[PDB]
Amino acid sequence: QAEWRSWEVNKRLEYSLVKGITEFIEQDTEEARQQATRPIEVIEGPLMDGMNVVGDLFGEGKMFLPQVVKSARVMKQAVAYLEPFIEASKEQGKTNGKMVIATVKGDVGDIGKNIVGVVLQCNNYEIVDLGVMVPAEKILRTAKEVNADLIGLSGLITPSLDEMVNVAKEMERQGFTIPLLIGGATTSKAHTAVKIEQNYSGPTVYVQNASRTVGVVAALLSDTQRDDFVARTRKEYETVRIQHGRKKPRTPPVTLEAARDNDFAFDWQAYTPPVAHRLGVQEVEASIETLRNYIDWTPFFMTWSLAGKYPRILEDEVVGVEAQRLFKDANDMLDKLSAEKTLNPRGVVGLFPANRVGDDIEIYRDETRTHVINVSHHLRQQTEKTGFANYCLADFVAPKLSGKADYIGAFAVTGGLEEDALADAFEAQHDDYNKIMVKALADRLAEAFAEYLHERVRKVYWGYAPNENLSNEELIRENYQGIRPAPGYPACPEHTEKATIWELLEVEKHTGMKLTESFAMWPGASVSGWYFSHPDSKYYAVAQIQRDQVEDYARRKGMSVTEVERWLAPNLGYDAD
Template sequence: MHTAVKIAPRYSNPVIYVLDASRSVPVVASLLDPNQKDEFAQDIAEEYEEMRQEYYDGLEEKRLLSLQAARNKAFKINWQMSPPAQKPAFIGTKLFDNYPLEKLLDRIDWNPFFQVFQLRGRYPNRGFPKIFDDETVGAEAKRLFDDAQTMVKQILKNNSLTARAVVGFYPANSVGDDIQIYEDETRSTAVKTFFGLRQQNEKESDEPYYCLSDFIAPRETGLPDYLGIFAASAGFGADELSNKYRDDQDDYSSIMVKAIADRFAEALAEKLHEDIRKEYWGYAPDEELTAADLFAVKYHGIRPAPGYPSQPDHTEKLAMWDLGDIAKQSGITLTESLAMEPGASVSALVFGHRESKYFAVGKIDKDQ
């Protein structure tokens, strides 16, 4: 939608959104094929025009509350009855270098992997492993999965990919819509501020208007609270291996390497978050959840990522990277547009309160 509304109208040539870089191959192939380019570009242009019209029609229907009105209807936690999570096991950062990929194998969510190759089962055979039973794509999905397992074994045998992560915890309190990070437990000196965005789209129900700062104890309560961060990557070595396959004219394997690295990175994020809940922060030491429970977000606490619905501002990564010295410690860097390098990387803020929840900020007004 953002591409259709904000970007495409500013260019005379085709502008096409792809969900993931690894899916760009068929799009580029269509654009380079003189027999397909014009029709393909026209189809996209017509689709984007319909999306723009839908977007502008929606604007007429939606009302935005003023920022002050939204703040007046903010989510309120009774901090005396439901205090912040306990103090983490350490304050500051911890580096996980050369994290064993073998520990992540049972954490991999394979569903997005098939989407990279544009394989989708139809109901009731959507998702992994039901996709193997689909009449249309089942056989191809099984072959793809088997090839991926072979490549995973090769990666593990040859140590082709390296996983690395940084986890950090810091004294924190909310001040209005923002979250202040303090130098030490005296909380007298703020060293960083994470700027929250509050929902403003008018709601028909009595549901509150959320902001991430709602889940951190306000400074005026006098209660000590904490904020966690992490950055994780399983992409070290992925570009080199992918380029090797590409140089050998093996585009299939070149794409698969990056898709597998992405799966390992997401699995590492899942594992780190579990270890945070059970050990490093330790607010859920007795948690026992299945893989399905984890994918269904049945755990306490949340890990919203900058650039995603609960915190759509990518610039918050700058505060994270500076606070945790992430680039120097881990080698995970930020580009000018604040994308993470290596590409197979994940980062997030970590909130421990049991009432914290994911939400979408949505559209905001100029007063915010």
């Protein structure tokens, strides 16, 4: 009554690993210990071997991320049984190199990091994950105390960039030699090699994904390749360094008053903005169930390094089946999560009468437009345009002078508060796979709410398009009137406004959601942003803004020209000073 249950305990483990079979993992790694002289053998023996297979497979493209992390789960849970035996014993094994991984300062994005985390322990490296919002201080300090071979920083929103760069200067100033590895949503070949590398005398590499992380972490710890690599990269980052400062025959940059002059043209006297049916701050609620439908799974599969869009990915050739299998496992966890009610999304919406003044929107107390309670600020494209507007989000709102009644809204949500709680649980039982799952869904769940609310606002709450029945697949294409710009995106790069949002809706109170040093959000699975109704409104990016606007924004916000240059760094069309 079994099958593989009659093999040598060593082939048994080696197989249970690849397949990712954890139901015998305890008594299997055990028995193999009794038949082994010293604890550490079952590790460098069956297990370690089980992993090279995965790795072999992963390479020909037979296996995938979903399973890999899944095999690790076994791999870990085994070493997690020999803790007391391996410890109280001889030598206790070794690795290819120990690494300090961490989500930089003020940032709370960590999914891509765990993956890299796990993908590396899967090639036998020791990974010390400090977590998120970690001081450039605690990163290197630990780099020191645990004698790491290389520091890895992870970033997600714009503000983090200045953190990494603050970390390199620190690595330059603190005389560090090891290699700096930088990654995350925001990092790029270019950004690393323009503003980061040239601050760290040591090797400073940028990698695009956990797969390629291994190739670099290899070369960077190779008695051979190291010298031959760091050097190929230094000279590579130079090439791109000089191609980005060629100041290509670029469209000359216009003056802040010119652009502003060339504003979004529209006859407002003739147009009457849709009265927002429901004025006021409201706390909405939706169960996972409700949300499930609105989930755009694509990003999900991109989270799990499975390329392609859904549902086309399911019928894919090389990866399709797994995509199917991965896709199931999730839904499965979702079912559980929706029933027991252990991960509940929350959210808060709101609609306030507004109007346009300069490049900002004025939010009004009551229908009277007598008292200003909050001012949403927006930047304005500052390149030379002809025939087209110099788009500035505020334009899509009936100015003050037109005395026309226009409106604006905002929201914030989250796939659940218990996100972190549930995540840690899996860390506990060493379930990397499920740790990364619960998070990847919360997101989907979060991102999901945003779509739902928006639709409901579009339908009910604001009520300008009550007879709307687009499909989920259509909602994914933005086939509706109006947008929902959110702080950070190119349409409105200034992250601090998320504060204002928190203010209007008093997020903290209705959802518990919070904001951090770098105006990121907690839980990680969160989405906040603005609601615009005017039909012409589009997600048009800011791009580069000159010195004049930064100043004028300075005042507006009531900040220092410098404090603004920080938060806006990406979009500075002039010399970053």
